Design a protein around this ligand. Structure first.
Ligand SMILES: CCCCCCCCCCCCCCCCCC(=O)OC[C@H](COP(=O)([O-])OCC(O)COP(=O)([O-])OC[C@@H](COC(=O)CCCCCCCCCCCCCCCCC)OC(=O)CCCCCCCCCCCCCCCCC)OC(=O)CCCCCCCCCCCCCCCCC
Ligand SMILES: CCCCCCCCCCCCCCCCCC(=O)OC[C@H](COP(=O)([O-])OCC(O)COP(=O)([O-])OC[C@@H](COC(=O)CCCCCCCCCCCCCCCCC)OC(=O)CCCCCCCCCCCCCCCCC)OC(=O)CCCCCCCCCCCCCCCCC
Ligand SMILES: COC1=C(OC)C(=O)C(C/C=C(/C)CC/C=C(/C)CC/C=C(/C)CC/C=C(\C)CC/C=C(\C)CC/C=C(\C)CC/C=C(/C)CC/C=C(/C)CC/C=C(/C)CCC=C(C)C)=C(C)C1=O
Ligand SMILES: CCCCCCCCCCCCCCCCC[C@@H](O)O[C@H](CO[C@H](O)CCCCCCCCCCCCCCC)COP(=O)(O)OCC[N+](C)(C)C
Ligand SMILES: CCCCCCCCCCCCCCCCC[C@@H](O)O[C@H](CO[C@H](O)CCCCCCCCCCCCCCC)COP(=O)(O)OCC[N+](C)(C)C
Ligand SMILES: CCCCCCCC/C=C\CCCCCCCC(=O)OC[C@H](COP(=O)(O)OCCN)OC(=O)CCCCCCC/C=C\CCCCCCCC
Ligand SMILES: CCCCCCCC/C=C\CCCCCCCC(=O)OC[C@H](COP(=O)(O)OCCN)OC(=O)CCCCCCC/C=C\CCCCCCCC
Ligand SMILES: CCCCCCCC/C=C\CCCCCCCC(=O)OC[C@H](COP(=O)(O)OCCN)OC(=O)CCCCCCC/C=C\CCCCCCCC
Ligand SMILES: CCCCCCCC/C=C\CCCCCCCC(=O)O[C@H](COC(=O)CCCCCCC/C=C/CCCCCCCC)COP(=O)(O)OCCN
Lengths: 318, 114, 175, 98, 83, 347, 70, 115, 105
């Protein structure tokens, strides 16, 4: 019966990712004065299915100069970790209830980079290596700031339990308390998910395909699914963190609908941003994160440590 | 280095308090108010003797006093109490915050009944 | 003996140690240390130390990312070595696996003394506490007492980290 | 001592042995240093959790901190050596004799 | 009086992020030492009963110690509900 | 390197040593060793010159390995007794691991290989610090845990250090390697008496430190790091070579000089514990140190080597920066034997 | 159209509804319909185990009220 | 136990997808097809050659800064202590020295990539 | 060597963390608080040499609490005899050791 719950979490996530791709194409098209997919199915509703069936019936290629074990392990690790990040999210009840769910997401997101690193290295081609090294620089840029931002925000929660965040925001959204932290958190999520204007690893105009340039068919499809599931997952995490829906224990579906609407709004904002800005330079991303976000984040961390003691606002939990 | 002294299975016999956790939490405040003397005697024994074998008789009186307390609640208003702990039991964290109307009904019963 | 979960995890920990102790290509060595860090996190979780296991796993993920980046620059070695690519690396890996299995067998069905003391097995579940109380996590309170009891520890750790920044900047200056 | 303690101690011994028996790359030895730190962290955490020594729960974290300072030190040196030889091989460190 | 003003103007014109971060950090350092509520927080952290209050043995000359929880002796939390 | 940065690194090295010296908790002693090493590495690299990089890398690898074994011994001791206080080390495997880690840190044989290389690869000021200040923390730890120390292992390493320092010094023309082998021999002398009397260990350490400071300052004054470079000093500053000869004779252990006091004081102690063969072998082995000191004295002061023409120009200039503690150090390293009983003030 | 984007968003929203509602329904179904008990600390776990012991059927969710006091 | 089942399920699903991707379609692998990609022309050197890191000092610095989040992560629990004045002094002390570390690296040109 | 500045100044830099019986947060006790307290009290002020011989009973009990070696040996000797007695078949363990017990609150 817990297996049924695992499947009821996994399969709908994959369906949402498949249709997220259709949504991105349609939103970008209408923002570019065109229509996007509207032939394959009514309103392009069958386009993701055609894409998936096409990618899983095409020839997967193993490069001659590549290391096979890492080459094959990396997409598996990417997709499995993308699916694993969803299990502690309370919607309003989590599949897995963790004391330190935030730390769990931090650690698994840190482990997810090695899929790109090992993929790029094991492809044994120059563009894949350049993409992998860009991933190294990107993680170095965003990780410290993202962790300190999370700590500063959760000083209002009293713990790292994700369900407590619902109780914390019972009367007001936490974005009214820490919008300067929310802005930097949103930009750091853009960097962490390798999304434009921070999509350095793929580097399409610049590096052709970046890290997965040598990937074809099903393995490439798995990388794509992992990336889009990560987009949805990070936006759901932000929605839980900063825009807390009210939860009625006798009618949890109201919370579920509200939370899903907020997650969709944030994902559509991601797609909106991709159609508006040019790409960063990756050293410029490092300098943005280390010379602007880091000092402000340190100062705001001190402020959010002092404020509950200043005003006698310390949250309950031990 | 010696045999460990243990009580017999008969000395460990007592009338059990077989109510559930939500039932205990619904009555916890009044129970702590009413059965305080035997409870504190047993806890003083437990923390002074540092040995469960030396405070069995006080634990038996703790059980007996809890039985008397629950006997008074069932005898005077079981209905109001039952609606209060049932509402408390539904919560996954067993929250006092979510059942304030039922709690009021139970408190106002026990204020004039007892 | 129950589910052998802790023993399996410790065995995988040792196997990962053997993997990076073989001294093959660092990219591979880094992977073995990541496997060991995750499995050690699992071991610590199986004992009530959630925070410590998660923290060590996060720290080693970051450190191994830096090591991967450094390997691509300064330890590249055009034909990088996997465990089966060279007789020395394979020999060391097989020696480690065989030595671990020999120690486990000698300590499992019989009760041998290796260096310090002996072991009969019994599963690690035997040595637990039975303590029943608490609205907090004892591990969390112990770690949090660093800011009230460990004032001296905070002072020396912070000074060492600042000096570490200065020191790394001095070493790589060159000239 | 249970089997887990001996597995952790064996991990430390394997790492120490790995450190001592040099191959060619300097980075391969820095990895064995990191492994020794990881084994110490796990061992001390297990001992501390088992005996319920609450205050000692902060010492592995401290143990982690000075693990980074030692790694960052080593990598720093690995840079300079490489900048001299274009290679991190320990064979090149033979200018000084006994 | 006049040098610091020009320096602040130049810093606000060129690096507003650094000015904002330094101001926020300075406020975070200074304000807790000037607040009346900082004591209250401590008192709140002292009122949270994590462990069991073990009773004392009544030696017969312990006036301020209560004999029952509802007796008027002992610490009061009335200041907390009105806060 | 900036002078302020150099000053703060020196203060961090000293602070790590003092943290080891004032701690009762094993973790703080370990932290003191780590803090000492962290600030010690950049001091060895102050002048870049890739030999310094090599010496710093070798020193770091040796000291990090020793630190890891030290931490493992601490954890084993904690496992077999829930104790963090530095005491008699309830477990013998932990005691062996701790003794080996401290022997690696000090450079006792057979963990002695790194000392000559690191000393040759660094400058003379760095060598002075490495051979004087760096010995305080490990010896202060060994004094504390001396009661639980296994005599057979400690004395084996002490005899090996004396033999190896004496044999290694015979083959050296470079002055820094000579100093390193002298340091190894004196460490062996220090650790031979440690299980019997820690006051004798402290006395030997103090006399060795003053003698080493005098020798290193005399080598800094005359910028000589080789035997042939030192052989030119008679023709520029004869007084420096005369004081160097007397200091070398004292380091040899010849009576009535200051160097003799520790050996005389150690042998006597070992005879009160019914140890006769050990002091006799140690005293006879110290003659190798005396031989390669006498050879240096022959090269620099007791005969005159040929000089160069450009030395004439050096006759017109004076040593600009003066070392204020050099005269006191020379007098303390030579003329102090009549005040031997004052050693009772060390216990 | 721009409202032709809406069908895909509706499909995605329907897909994203399922996990939370399914978890809530499965929690109710396996927990007696009275919500899944949360045990962040050992005291809550002790309460759950006591409930399982006194339930007479080895289920923590079955609740024994004042009908067990004779 | 539930988390172990979840991890096993996710990894099994991903591996099954890889297996279907590699065993369902028709493979016609030949030497030209499997050759490395560099925009139509054969690569000059190896992709296993040293690739310089220009941000090497930031990467070493990230190691120390990453360990400071480990020291700051227990802060939510430390706010529950009675010695709030001591606790707040230590928390601010650690963040001030962290900022001072960044200030030293920034002013001494440590955050600039090598050319 | 050891310069006891903590004792001289009464500063307590690291003595709060040396033993497990020393003022834990929230009064959480160590697993062996009584044993270490008894061993420490018995050996206080008599010196290391005397304590090793005269407080060996307390220290042995403390070590038994720490590692529980004798307890595991006794349990193993119990279960080996039980296994032998069941393999040839004349024990028949009671129903409350197989899962057929009536649990108490
Ligand atoms: C203890 C003993 C452990 C035994 C392991 C299994 C037995 C060894 C053989 C299986 C692995 C290699 C398979 C293989 O080489 O097929 C070649 C085969 C044909 O080769 P070829 O093209 O003729 O030759 C090419 C060259 O040889 C060029 O080939 P190459 O250079 O690619 O070869 C490299 C390969 C060659 O193999 C070897 O060198 C010897 C094996 C050494 C592996 C052990 C090293 C230590 C690693 C740490 C310990 C991991 C746990 C192990 C214990 C588990 C116990 C339950 O070594 C590896 O890369 C193995 C890596 C597996 C590590 C998995 C770690 C996942 C990390 C996830 C992140 C962390 C999560 C948190 C924790 O190609 C294929 O079959 C298709 C792909 C096969 C790979 C599928 C995925 C790997 C299989 C599962 C591995 C375990 C995953 C768990
Ligand atoms: C049993 C009883 C007996 C016990 C015996 C104990 C042991 C006895 C001695 C053992 C052996 C000692 C060996 C010393 C080796 C030193 C190496 C060396 O300096 O090079 C040689 C040096 C070579 O000179 P050179 O090459 O011609 O000069 C060129 C420059 O090097 C070119 O460099 P530059 O251009 O960069 O020049 C910069 C220069 C110029 O200087 C400046 O411009 C000054 C600038 C000021 C900057 C301010 C920065 C402040 C910010 C940093 C804060 C750091 C905080 C660290 C603490 C963190 C704590 C967590 O600075 C220096 O040259 C070095 C500065 C030295 C600073 C000393 C720091 C002391 C720290 C104390 C730590 C303990 C604190 C308590 C800890 C508690 C636990 C936590 O000349 C000598 O030193 C000759 C030997 C001197 C030895 C002295 C004799 C022994 C002591 C006798 C006095 C009485 C002692 C007993 C006292 C009893 C208690 C009252
Ligand atoms: C500026 O041009 C560009 C665009 O604009 C036109 C893009 O859109 C664009 C993005 C790429 C698009 C073409 C989208 C591609 C669509 C995916 C690759 C298809 C992925 C869909 C499947 C793999 C998901 C799985 C399919 C199932 C139905 C899900 C359920 C799973 C079962 C187990 C159940 C790029 C890169 C681009 O460059
Ligand atoms: C969505 C995620 C879950 C999916 C759930 C379903 C899981 C599906 C399983 C994944 C594999 C998909 C592969 C589908 C095609 C079959 C490929 C292979 O298995 O068949 C052949 C297997 O046959 C082999 O030749 C060996 C046959 C016999 C030798 C050993 C088998 C012994 C079994 C005994 C069989 C006798 C009767 C048994 C009755 C039960 C191999 O042929 P090959 O050309 O290489 O591969 C390319 C396949 N093409 C042609 C379709 C492109
Ligand atoms: C004599 C030395 C003076 C000159 C030499 C300086 C060298 C030493 C460096 C700094 C010395 C400070 C260390 C003093 C030990 C701290 C512990 C003691 O003082 O009490 C603490 C007082 O700490 C306070 O926060 C004030 C001291 C903090 C000082 C701020 C840090 C500045 C250090 C800067 C020098 C260090 C190296 C350089 C780094 C920049 C906390 O006590 P409290 O919490 O009541 O009760 C604890 C007992 N409980 C838990 C059972 C209830
Ligand atoms: C369906 C028929 C079943 C056949 C099984 C064959 C399995 C196999 O290894 O074959 C290799 C097979 C086919 O290659 P070819 O021979 O070139 O083409 C075949 C077409 N004639 O290649 C593959 O597809 C390999 C599939 C991946 C293996 C699956 C298991 C991998 C396990 C990964 C564990 C690590 C996960 C990492 C993330 C988890 C961390 C939390
Ligand atoms: C990879 C690393 C995975 C990390 C897993 C962490 C999961 C987690 O944090 O959940 C903690 C969870 C509950 O703890 P709390 O909710 O915080 O408090 C207890 C009160 N209820 O604890 C657990 O359930 C621990 C269960 C065992 C841990 C799982 C270990 C998994 C190790 C993976 C090994 C897989 C094979 C080895 C190699 C892999 C690839 C070759
Ligand atoms: C994750 C989302 C998508 C998941 C994937 C689901 C895909 C399900 C639909 C599969 C459709 C059927 C597959 C047909 C394509 C397979 C490859 C192919 O077309 O090869 C055709 C090949 C032609 O070769 P030859 O005529 O012998 O000579 C050529 C040499 N010169 O003929 C074949 O091999 C066809 C054999 C029957 C294919 C089996 C189809 C069964 C359905 C697959 C379901 C997968 C479940 C796992
Ligand atoms: C009292 C509490 C203090 C601590 C709290 C602050 C927490 C963390 C904040 C600081 C984090 C680290 C800061 C790092 C400092 C950077 C130094 C630096 O390098 O500055 C130069 C620039 O110079 C500056 O330092 C900027 C101005 C000087 C500092 C900023 C202002 C200082 C304080 C201002 C606020 C004071 C309070 C506000 C008063 C309000 C008015 C009444 C950098 O620019 P470049 O990289 O060289 O640019 C090249 C491309 N063109």
């Amino acid at each position: 019966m817990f297996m049924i719950n695992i499947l009821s979490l996994i399969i709908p996530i994959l369906l949402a990712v498949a249709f997220l791709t259709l949504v991105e194409r349609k939103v970008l098209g209408y923002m570019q004065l065109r229509k996007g997919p509207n032939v394959v199915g009514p309103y392009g509703l069958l386009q993701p299915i055609a894409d998936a069936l096409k990618l899983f019936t095409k020839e997967p290629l193993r490069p001659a100069t590549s290391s096979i074990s890492m080459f094959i392990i990396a997409p598996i690790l990417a997709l499995s970790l993308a699916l694993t990040m969803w299990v502690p999210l309370p919607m309003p009840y989590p599949l897995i209830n963790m004391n330190l769910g935030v730390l769990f997401m931090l650690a698994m997101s840190s482990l997810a980079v090695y899929s790109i690193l090992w993929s790029g290295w094991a492809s044994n081609s120059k563009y894949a290596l350049i993409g992998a090294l860009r991933a190294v620089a990107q993680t170095i840029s965003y990780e410290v700031t993202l962790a300190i931002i999370l700590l500063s925000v959760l000083l209002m929660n009293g713990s790292y339990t994700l369900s407590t965040l619902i109780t914390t925001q019972e009367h007001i959204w936490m974005i009214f308390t820490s919008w300067p932290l929310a802005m930097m958190w949103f930009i750091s999520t853009l960097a962490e998910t390798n999304r434009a204007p921070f999509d350095l690893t793929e580097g399409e105009s610049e590096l052709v395909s970046g890290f997965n340039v040598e990937y074809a068919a099903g393995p490439f499809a798995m990388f794509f699914m992992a990336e889009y599931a990560n987009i949805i997952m990070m936006n759901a995490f932000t929605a839980i963190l900063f825009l807390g829906a009210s939860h009625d224990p006798h009618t949890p579906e109201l919370y579920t609908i509200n939370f899903v609407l907020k997650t969709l709004a944030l994902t559509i904002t991601f797609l909106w941003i991709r159609a508006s800005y040019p790409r960063f330079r990756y050293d410029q991303l490092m300098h943005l994160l280390w010379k602007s976000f880091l000092p402000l984040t340190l100062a705001l961390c001190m402020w959010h440590i002092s404020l509950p003691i200043m005003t006698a606002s310390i949250p309950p939990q031990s | 280095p010696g045999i460990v002294e243990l009580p017999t299975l008969e000395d460990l016999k007592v009338q059990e308090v077989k109510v559930s956790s939500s039932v205990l939490k619904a009555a916890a405040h009044h129970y702590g108010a009413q059965c305080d003397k035997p409870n504190k005697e047993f806890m003083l024994c437990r923390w002074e003797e540092k040995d469960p074998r030396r405070c069995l008789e006080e634990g038996k009186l703790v059980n007996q006093c809890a039985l008397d307390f629950f006997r008074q609640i069932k005898r005077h208003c079981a209905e109001p109490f039952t609606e209060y702990w049932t509402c408390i039991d539904y919560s996954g964290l067993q929250l006092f915050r979510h059942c304030r109307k039922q709690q009021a009904k139970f408190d106002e019963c026990v204020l004039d009944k007892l | 003996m129950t589910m052998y979960i802790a023993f399996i995890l410790s065995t995988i920990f040792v196997i990962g140690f053997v993997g990076f102790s073989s001294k093959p290509s660092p990219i591979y060595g880094g992977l073995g240390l990541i496997v060991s860090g995750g499995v050690g996190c699992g071991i610590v979780l199986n004992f009530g130390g959630s925070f410590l296991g998660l923290m060590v796993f996060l720290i080693y993920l970051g450190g191994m990312l830096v090591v991967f980046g450094y390997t691509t620059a300064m330890a590249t070695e055009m034909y990088p070595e996997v465990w089966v690519s060279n007789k020395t690396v394979f020999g060391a890996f097989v020696s480690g696996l065989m030595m671990e299995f020999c120690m486990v067998y000698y300590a499992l069905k019989e009760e041998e003394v290796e260096i310090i003391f002996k072991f009969n097995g019994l599963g690690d579940w035997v040595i637990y506490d039975t303590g029943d109380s608490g609205f907090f996590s004892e591990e969390a309170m112990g770690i949090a007492a660093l800011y009230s009891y460990g004032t001296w520890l905070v002072i020396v750790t912070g000074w060492s980290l600042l000096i570490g920044v200065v020191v790394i900047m001095e070493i790589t200056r060159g000239n | 001592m249970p089997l887990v303690y001996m597995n952790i101690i064996m991990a430390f011994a394997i790492a120490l042995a790995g450190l001592l028996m040099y191959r060619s790359h300097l980075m391969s030895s820095l990895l064995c240093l990191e492994g020794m730190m990881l084994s110490l962290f796990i061992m001390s955490t297990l001992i501390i959790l088992n005996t319920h020594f609450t205050l000692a729960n902060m010492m592995p974290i401290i143990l982690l901190v000075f693990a980074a300072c030692e790694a960052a030190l080593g990598l720093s040196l690995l840079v300079m050596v490489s900048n001299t030889y274009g290679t991190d091989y320990v064979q090149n460190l033979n200018l000084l004799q006994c | 009086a006049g040098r610091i003003a020009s320096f602040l103007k130049n810093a606000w014109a060129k690096e507003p992020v650094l000015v904002a971060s330094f101001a926020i950090g300075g406020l975070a350092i200074i304000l807790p030492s000037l607040s009346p509520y900082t004591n209250y927080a401590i008192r709140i952290n002292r009122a949270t009963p994590y462990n069991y209050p073990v009773p004392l043995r009544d030696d017969g000359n312990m006036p301020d110690v209560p004999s029952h929880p509802q007796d008027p002796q002992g610490p009061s939390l009335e200041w907390l509900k009105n806060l | 390197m900036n002078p302020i940065i150099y000053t703060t690194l020196i203060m961090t090295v000293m602070s790590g040593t003092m943290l080891v010296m004032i701690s009762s908790h094993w973790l703080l002693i370990w932290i003191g060793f780590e803090m000492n090493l962290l600030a010690m590495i950049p001091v060895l690299m102050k002048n870049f010159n890739p030999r310094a990089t090599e010496a710093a890398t070798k020193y770091f690898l040796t000291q990090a390995t020793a630190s890891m074994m030290l931490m493992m011994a601490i954890i084993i001791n904690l496992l077999y007794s829930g104790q963090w206080t530095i005491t008699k080390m309830f477990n013998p495997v932990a005691m062996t691991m701790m003794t080996m880690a401290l022997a690696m840190k000090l450079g006792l044989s057979p963990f002695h290989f790194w000392v000559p290389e690191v000393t040759q690869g660094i400058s003379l000021q760095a060598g002075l610090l490495l051979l004087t200040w760096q010995k305080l923390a490990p010896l202060s730890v060994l004094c504390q845990i001396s009661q639980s120390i296994n005599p057979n292992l400690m004395l084996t390493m002490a005899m090996l250090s004396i033999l190896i320092g004496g044999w290694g010094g015979l083959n050296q023309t470079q002055l820094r390697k000579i100093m390193a082998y002298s340091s190894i021999a004196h460490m062996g002398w220090m650790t031979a008496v440690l299980p019997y009397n820690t006051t004798m260990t402290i006395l030997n350490l103090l006399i060795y430190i003053t003698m080493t400071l005098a020798m290193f300052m005399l080598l800094i004054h005359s910028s000589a790091t080789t035997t042939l470079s030192l052989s030119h000093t008679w023709n520029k500053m004869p007084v420096i070579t005369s004081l160097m000869m007397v200091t070398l004779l004292s380091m040899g252990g010849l009576p009535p000089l200051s160097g003799f006091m520790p050996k005389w004081m150690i042998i006597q102690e070992m005879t009160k514990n019914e140890s006769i063969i050990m002091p006799t072998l140690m005293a006879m082995t110290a003659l190798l140190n005396l031989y390669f000191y006498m050879r240096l004295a022959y090269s620099s002061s007791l005969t005159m080597f040929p000089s160069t023409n450009n030395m004439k120009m050096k006759w017109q200039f004076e040593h600009t920066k003066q070392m204020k503690l050099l005269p006191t150090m020379i007098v303390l390293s030579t003329l102090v034997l009549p005040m031997t009983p004052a050693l009772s003030s060390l216990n | 159209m721009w409202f032709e984007i809406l069908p895909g968003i509706a499909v995605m929203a329907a897909c994203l509804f399922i996990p939370g509602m399914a978890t809530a329904h499965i929690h109710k179904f396996t927990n007696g319909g009275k919500e899944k008990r949360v045990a962040h600390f050992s005291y809550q776990w002790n309460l759950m185990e006591r409930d399982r012991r006194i339930s007479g059927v080895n289920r923590y969710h079955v609740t024994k009220g004042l009908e067990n006091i004779d | 136990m539930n988390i172990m089942l979840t991890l096993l399920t996710n990894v099994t699903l991903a591996s099954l997808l890889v297996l279907i991707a590699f065993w369902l379609p028709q493979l016609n692998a030949y030497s030209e097809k499997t050759s490395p990609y560099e925009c139509g022309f054969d690569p000059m050197g190896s992709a296993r050659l040293p690739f310089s890191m220009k941000f090497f000092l930031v990467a070493i610095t990230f190691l120390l800064f990453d360990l400071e989040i480990a020291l700051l992560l227990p802060l939510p629990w430390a706010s529950q202590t009675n010695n709030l004045k001591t606790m707040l002094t230590m928390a601010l002390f650690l963040l001030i020295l962290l900022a001072a570390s960044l200030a030293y690296e920034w002013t001494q040109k440590g955050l600039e990539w090598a050319e | 060597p050891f310069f006891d500045v903590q004792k001289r100044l009464g500063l307590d830099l690291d003595r709060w963390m040396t033993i497990q019986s020393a003022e834990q947060p929230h009064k959480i006790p160590g697993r062996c608080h009584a044993f270490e307290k008894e061993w420490i009290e018995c050996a206080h002020g008599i010196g290391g040499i005397r304590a090793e011989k005269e407080c060996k009973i307390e220290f042995d009990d403390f070590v038994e609490c720490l590692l529980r070696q004798k307890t595991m040996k006794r349990l193993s000797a119990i279960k080996r005899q039980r296994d032998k007695l069941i393999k040839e078949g004349k024990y028949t363990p009671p129903p409350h050791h197989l899962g057929k017990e009536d649990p108490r609150p």
